[PDB]
Design an enzyme around this catalytic site. Structure first.
Site, mmCIF file in Angstrom:
data_model
loop_
_atom_site.group_PDB
_atom_site.id
_atom_site.type_symbol
_atom_site.label_atom_id
_atom_site.label_comp_id
_atom_site.label_asym_id
_atom_site.label_seq_id
_atom_site.Cartn_x
_atom_site.Cartn_y
_atom_site.Cartn_z
ATOM 1 C CG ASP A 61 -12.090 3.662 -9.734
ATOM 2 O OD1 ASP A 61 -12.318 4.604 -8.940
ATOM 3 O OD2 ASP A 61 -11.286 2.739 -9.481
ATOM 4 C CG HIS A 72 -10.974 2.730 -5.963
ATOM 5 N ND1 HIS A 72 -10.042 2.804 -6.978
ATOM 6 C CD2 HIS A 72 -10.286 2.880 -4.808
ATOM 7 C CE1 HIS A 72 -8.840 2.985 -6.459
ATOM 8 N NE2 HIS A 72 -8.959 3.029 -5.144
ATOM 9 C CB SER A 104 -5.956 1.960 -3.965
ATOM 10 O OG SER A 104 -6.381 3.220 -3.514
ATOM 11 C CE1 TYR A 105 1.538 5.997 -2.137
ATOM 12 C CE2 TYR A 105 -0.021 7.832 -2.293
ATOM 13 C CZ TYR A 105 1.292 7.357 -2.219
ATOM 14 O OH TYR A 105 2.367 8.227 -2.228
ATOM 15 C CE1 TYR A 135 -3.979 1.857 -0.031
ATOM 16 C CE2 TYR A 135 -2.869 3.191 1.694
ATOM 17 C CZ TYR A 135 -3.892 3.015 0.762
ATOM 18 O OH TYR A 135 -4.838 3.991 0.609
#
Ligand SMILES: N[C@H]1CC(C(=O)N2CCn3c(nnc3C(F)(F)F)C2)=CC[C@@H]1c1cc(F)c(F)cc1F
Lengths: 726, 726
Positions: free
Chosen positions: B670, B702, B592-593, B509
């Site tokens: 998304d 997402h 994601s990140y 992450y």
């Protein structure tokens, strides 16, 4: 020994075919551009002068995309700032170079973002379409005249087509037609006001913060269609103290009753124009023939010169109703129409009589009418040897239909079984262009006795490079299924052996009027797969195929995704029994309609195919445009053909995909087969738990044709096929 | 011998974790939401009675999504027709049921498509939001008073957040705060008139002919932000013939000089409300403390009572400034702030006193304040054993900061190092939720003497099931990077043997304040990878990591995509030096990140990684929203931080991808990290000639969380990772 035809050879175009692209300027001479400069060739002796020097536009300061010399020989139109739109449309900037005073014209120039430009056919008048309106220049340096003022982006199109007419009816952006001596300018007007919009994201250069939404008027099956109007304007008449007057030609009544299309416009003389209209139910077309009336300045289409063309087994024409070719006086004409036996042949019409007389006949078809003199009609057909995938030039004596001469059949029968032609102005000379099964060959001929004058380009340079390499070979043959014959081709690896067991790629299209089994020489992807990877690449023409008669072509009428997918399956079944196929390594791929078929095949649970690739496929017919789909499908109403529309979708066959390896590919900016279609495929595979491979191409359209996306896609597809087979 | 934890097990949820979700209703009782019916429980003795039977609404005629009981005990709110919007937002239909009369109320019901609904904290007053306006019902059966008249879809939101406030500041759709005795309703209003719109396609059911374009106001980095307004209304003084009067609380001075946010509202007493404001440069915040004035009917916020919370090294708060917990008389409060050492601790304030007094200290952080009595403050922290990835409940005597007792550390140190808590209304009781490293354990306690009343759920059923399956183990530990210790965890296959060599998958992450090394017990994809495929799955908390002080967390200030990506590389590098990793088989994946970091690592040109998977990555910071992005990056202007905005893109590293196998996945719907972001990655990769695998998920957002998509994405990732490691 030595080497093969590689992926990099195909993608880097290491072995280029040479062309001889010429442009007839008179009955006697032609132009011949190059990598440098423009020459004028005398057709009789083959001597040439320089029309204009390669260096002339060194300090032009723009990359020049194309040239256009006025029929005059007095001006050159320079096209640059070319920006592609749909398959045929684009915008560009234009300058006019005056060949008398050898200076660029700097006053009153054609504006940037121009949509279309055309010289009148004789002197040097100009017509262009800019911002959906028509302008006419009588001289290149003078202010242009506004013909049209109602043009509005995505709403009203004057002298240019909208999305659907571009793609599906005229196969062009252009919707204007000069009269033969340039006096009149005919044009169509399309109205998209009511047409619903396809909308998709375009992402653009990295620096664009928010994606933009492209929205184009695009009528899907059964939606509201654009309407159309037709006008003729006199370009001699135009003063400019007021609106030069467009005269509308409407109708006819049998067409005005409901939804209709304008499907052809063809000038007959200086004062007689023909129009073909077609019903939304693409069953019924009517041709009108309209005369200029000096005593009113109007156009009158005498019903009586009206000709009705219809079909009871299918749709009219190959893709649309064919275009007439008029005898000089414009009192009679010739067009290819369907036989009583369903074969397409030339019919001779008097303008005011309803019955035409067929001038050719037999179990083969006329591909196109190429030229007409007082004594002869020249045409292309697949008659020679009874092979539907060959093309030859014939002439027929107007005096006596019994006397027909093949002009290309015998010129070089082992190298050349596929021809197209390009006649000089009065058909005094013609250039033949042979495109296979051997290397392309270009020749000049004079019509007076069809004497071969000389070889223009024989591709010898390419010939030499190709024997340092192990090339594949092409087998063109047929098979027999419940009585009828159906042709196929196969691209065989070098050193083929009918004892061994090769892996086979079924390369498919299988659309209505398609032909994938022909004698054309190609250097493509299939060439790499055979040459380097030892895969057999096969294509089959089955039910729904073209140029073999309506019995075969109309078999899928109202019934897309039935027989044509079946025959592709049967074809494979037939191919493996031929003894040199490994029936564990049979794959299939298609782009477009071929994508659809591949998808439908891989979804039939026939077990014959191990893997497959669908590139920009249709997935259900309601997603595709009105003009193409309805031609073959009718309307998706419960009254018409809705049930079959709902039974012929790819996604309904999702479960059977459990039994094959599938790769699904689609450009995200596909204006034609919208990314929607693959988006619905994937969703149905997901919803049913089928693993598969996918690849989107951002900002690519139906062509996936930019230099880098083209390379990447064939690379990616190669990896997939090798993996499926290795 | 005997089974492993399989992909099916993870996907079909064969090994289920029991929970014990209770909902307190007083200082003494909670409701226990069974699948059948709701029991009310006595926390002292553990006895229960039925609150309502499973069959009470057997013929309601609708599925009931959620229940909510008035603080009274006289009314149940029933939620049905649930329709998800974003991460928190939704619409539903609501009915109110009379608990005494055991009757539905049929008059003056809450409308369908209600956006938010909330009881007052004491009685049975309702406040709801419908079509972007606020309404109040004093009694369930009486007409609503309309508080607000300005609401406009996508433009003005009263009492509910817009997209960016929902996701990035409030973590809820709700934007209204009842005062403690229900007298006042406070609410925010957001204006998005000028906020640019993100547009994307939503395909929907097969049967939808044309895709809809979803459009949502979403400010990307540096774009026009929503503006905000705050209002308080007296809910005891509404007249049904006259409009309700809202009193605005504006400003403050230090905020109004530019763009700003409202980031917290917390009532202090029946007549004192607290507000924190944050500048667009999230360096600087201000707490206003506002008093009701009886004479004028307004609210006054005394400069003198305002408290500044700023940062010289980074932003304020972990994600946002922390919430205050006011004492009984509302004249002082406790909130977590950053030390002089940069460690997050509890500070004690007086409202007119600028300096506060820290009541905790040391090299660890308070995670959250959980309850405040007049006597004690109960908080969770990571002090125990110096483990940043552990969580314990503490109490600290407010009269003596010397007396801090850990309430959870010692209960079961073997099984339980990670705790969350749920206090009854006045903190008479609390539920403890142990979530690892052993199986989750739920227990009840009484605060008075911290007695362990009883076990509520111990997961023994799961325990019995897991002994017949080869489960992976978990190591939590640290390495040392020049001075500082950095934590990692590894999910280790069963029968792990340090002398053997395993492929490693770095699960990442690595966002600002992220924590991926902890003691939580999890049954996920990593469990299967280790259990069945013998893959070590590792995660590393590097620079930018949370819960270890600002020195570490603020290391990436203004510099995202640097140290956090570098340290992830350093970590993999260091795991190979440990002796049990095959360094020809090191992989990286993140969502994601985690997708951005994975992508940035793969494109670093470091050669450590053979392959990796990016799911829904950010690709460049100008594409992401203002509030999240700007907090860490500042503004993308030459005057601020544009150069680094431009230097930290994924696509500028495309060339370096030639060295890796890459898998790019993204949902088309998304709303959060737009498909655009992956669309630009693949475009850059195609432009540079890098082959890679892609997958889109149509209509997925997402979360890619729908049942079928979830199963498909993990199946697809599994094959890919298996292929990489084979
Ligand atoms: N939109 C269609 C346009 C079209 C046409 O009208 N053509 C071209 C092919 N064509 C034509 N005349 N003569 C000849 C040729 F000689 F090549 F056979 C006109 C043929 C097929 C096109 C098509 C169909 C389809 F199912 C897709 F999914 C995509 C697609 F582009």
């Amino acid at each position: 020994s030595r080497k093969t035809y590689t992926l990099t050879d195909y993608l880097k175009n290491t072995y280029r075919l040479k062309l001889y692209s010429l442009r007839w300027i008179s009955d006697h001479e032609y132009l011949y551009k190059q990598e440098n400069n423009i020459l004028v060739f005398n057709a009789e002796y083959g001597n040439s002068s320089v029309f204009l020097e390669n260096s002339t536009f060194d300090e032009f300061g723009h990359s020049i995309n194309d040239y256009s010399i006025s029929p005059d020989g007095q001006f050159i139109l320079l096209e640059y700032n070319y920006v592609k739109q749909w398959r045929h449309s684009y915008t560009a900037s234009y300058d006019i170079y005056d060949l008398n005073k050898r200076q660029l014209i700097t006053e009153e120039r054609i504006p940037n973002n121009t949509q279309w430009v055309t010289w009148s056919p004789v002197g040097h008048k100009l017509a262009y379409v800019w911002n959906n309106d028509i302008y006419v220049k009588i001289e290149p340096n003078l202010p242009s005249y506004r013909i049209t003022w109602t043009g509005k982006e995505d709403i009203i199109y004057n002298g240019i087509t909208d999305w659907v007419y571009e793609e599906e009816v005229f196969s062009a952006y252009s919707a204007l037609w000069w009269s033969p001596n340039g006096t009149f300018l005919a044009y169509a007007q399309f109205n998209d006001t009511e047409v619903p919009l396809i909308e998709y994201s375009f992402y653009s250069d990295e620096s664009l913060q928010y994606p933009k939404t492209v929205r184009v008027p695009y009528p899907k099956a059964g939606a509201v269609n654009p309407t159309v109007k037709f006008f003729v304007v006199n370009t001699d008449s135009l003063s400019s103290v007021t609106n030069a007057t467009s005269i509308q030609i409407t109708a006819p009544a049998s067409m005005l009753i409901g939804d209709h299309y304008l499907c052809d416009v063809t000038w007959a003389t200086q004062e007689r124009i023909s129009l073909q209209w077609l019903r939304r139910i693409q069953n019924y077309s009517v041709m009108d023939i309209c005369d200029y009336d000096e005593s009113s300045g109007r156009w009158n289409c005498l019903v009586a010169r009206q000709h009705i063309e219809m079909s009871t087994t299918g749709w009219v024409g190959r893709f649309r109703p064919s275009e007439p070719h008029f005898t000089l006086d414009g009192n009679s004409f010739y067009k290819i129409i369907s036989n009583e036996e369903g074969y397409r042949h030339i019919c001779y019409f008097q303008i005011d009589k309803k019955d035409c007389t067929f001038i050719t006949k037999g179990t083969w078809e006329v591909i196109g009418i190429e030229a007409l003199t007082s004594d002869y009609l020249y045409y292309i057909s697949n008659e020679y040897k009874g092979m539907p995938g060959g093309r030859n030039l014939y002439k027929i004596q107007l005096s006596d239909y019994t006397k027909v001469t093949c002009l290309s059949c015998e010129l070089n029968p082992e190298r050349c079984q596929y021809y197209s032609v390009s006649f000089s102005k009065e058909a005094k000379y013609y250039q033949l262009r042979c495109s296979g099964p051997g290397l392309p060959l270009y020749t000049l001929h004079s019509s007076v006795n069809d004497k071969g004058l000389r070889v223009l380009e024989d591709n010898s340079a390419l010939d030499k490079m190709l024997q340092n390499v192990q090339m594949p070979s092409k087998k063109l043959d047929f098979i027999i299924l419940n009585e009828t014959k159906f042709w196929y081709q196969m691209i065989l690896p070098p050193h083929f052996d009918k004892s061994k067991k090769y892996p086979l790629l079924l390369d498919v299209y299988a659309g209505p009027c398609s032909q994938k089994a022909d004698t054309v020489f190609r250097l493509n992807w299939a060439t790499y797969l055979a040459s380097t990877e030892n895969i057999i690449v096969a294509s089959f023409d089955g039910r729904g195929s073209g140029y073999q008669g309506d019995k075969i072509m109309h078999a899928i009428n109202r019934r897309l995704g039935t027989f044509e997918v079946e025959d592709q399956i049967e074809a494979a079944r037939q191919f493996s029994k031929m003894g040199f196929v490994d029936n564990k390594r049979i794959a299939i791929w298609g782009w477009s309609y071929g994508g659809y078929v591949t998808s439908m095949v891989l979804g039939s649970g026939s077990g014959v195919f191990k893997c497959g690739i669908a590139v920009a496929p249709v997935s259900r017919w309601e997603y595709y445009d009105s003009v193409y789909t309805e031609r073959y499908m009718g309307l998706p109403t419960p009254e018409d053909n809705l049930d079959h529309y709902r039974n012929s979708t790819v996604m309904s066959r999702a479960e059977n995909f459990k039994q094959v390896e599938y790769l699904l590919i689609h450009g995200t900016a596909d204006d034609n087969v919208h990314f929607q279609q693959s988006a619905q495929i994937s969703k149905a595979l997901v919803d049913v738990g089928v693993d598969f491979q996918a690849m989107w191409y951002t900002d690519e359209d139906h062509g996936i044709a930019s230099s880098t996306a083209h390379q990447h896609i064939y690379t990616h597809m190669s990896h997939f096929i090798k993996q499926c087979f290795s």
